[PDB]
Copies of this chain bind each other. A is one copy, B any other.
Amino acid sequence: MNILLFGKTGQVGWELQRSLAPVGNLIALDVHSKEFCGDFSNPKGVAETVRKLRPDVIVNAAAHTAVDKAESEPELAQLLNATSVEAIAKAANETGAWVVHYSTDYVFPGTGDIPWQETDATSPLNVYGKTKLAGEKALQDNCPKHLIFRTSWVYAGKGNNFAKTMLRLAKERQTLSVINDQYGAPTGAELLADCTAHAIRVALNKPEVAGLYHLVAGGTTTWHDYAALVFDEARKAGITLALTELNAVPTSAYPTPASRPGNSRLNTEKFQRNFDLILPQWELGVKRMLTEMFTTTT
């Protein structure tokens, strides 16, 4: 069967290019796709594309993902995180195609301790969350063969990521400051991509799995504890670090235009039992990307 992937160059998209390749005949698009429209600024054009190809499955990894900039341009975000999602949803539903789509925990507020469930009420704390909410609701109302994967703290080894930015700091600096009161599970693009591939093959066989899912690596940590592991990992690999002092700091002390939740924890029991898949502890995925970065035959 035919699979159409939008957002092929993103973190998750680049991993989907790999994961979806054996599952069906993959057509991978992004914004610059010359010979096919992959620019979510043209909701009608991504519809046309979806009519032009007729896919059995659409995997959407494109989005407006700069949360802070979104506050300054809620319009463009709306277009990318909702308008084009509806346009692709309705078109998907013209042909009975499945639509796979990623969302975010920014759809919930904040209240430490408890992991959010799919049955929990939503009240988006910032713009990103809002437009993405509009996006999943739109998918929900226009295209019943869907899989929405709500995720959080996504990283990949290709391209910039938290680990790397922190490592640049740790090379160039002696003391460093990082949030220790935001809680979640760093989730690999590898894990996302692979789970998607399997979930597609179930859904084709069991249409009842359609719906909304929480999808993250297991466990929970904070940015400061995440950074500590990265530091330690790098010390263990022989990366010399200028860094001598690592201090934990509250969220508030340093500005971000759009608010971040203190509680990005997500319960993923729904996904685990509906797909019979395992979601490994967050550390595995991070240590693996760190090794790949450190043992770079080159």
Q: Residues of A at under 8 Å CB distance from B?
A: 17-19, 21-26, 158-161, 164, 190-191, 194-195, 197-198, 201, 277-280, 284, 288, 292-293, 295-298
Give how many copies assemble into the complex.
2
Closest Cβ of chain B to A44, distance in Å, is: 30
Contact A297 B21 (CB under 8 A): no
Partner among B158, B278, B284 whose Cβ is within 8 Å of the Cβ of A292: B158
Q: Given the known A-B contacts A23-B198, A277-B23, are A18 and B158 also in contact in the complex, defined by CB atoms under 8 Å?
A: no
Contact A19 B194 (CB under 8 A): yes
Contact A194 B197 (CB under 8 A): yes
Contact A278 B198 (CB under 8 A): no
Q: Given the known A-B contacts A160-B297, A293-B298, are A278 and B194 also in contact in the complex, defined by CB atoms under 8 Å?
A: no
Contact B22 A280 (CB under 8 A): yes
How many angstroms from the CA of A9 to the CA of B18 in the assembled complex? 20
Specify which chain B residues have a CB less than 8 angstroms from the CB of A191 in the assembled complex: 21-22
Most buried by B among A18, A278, A279, A288: A18
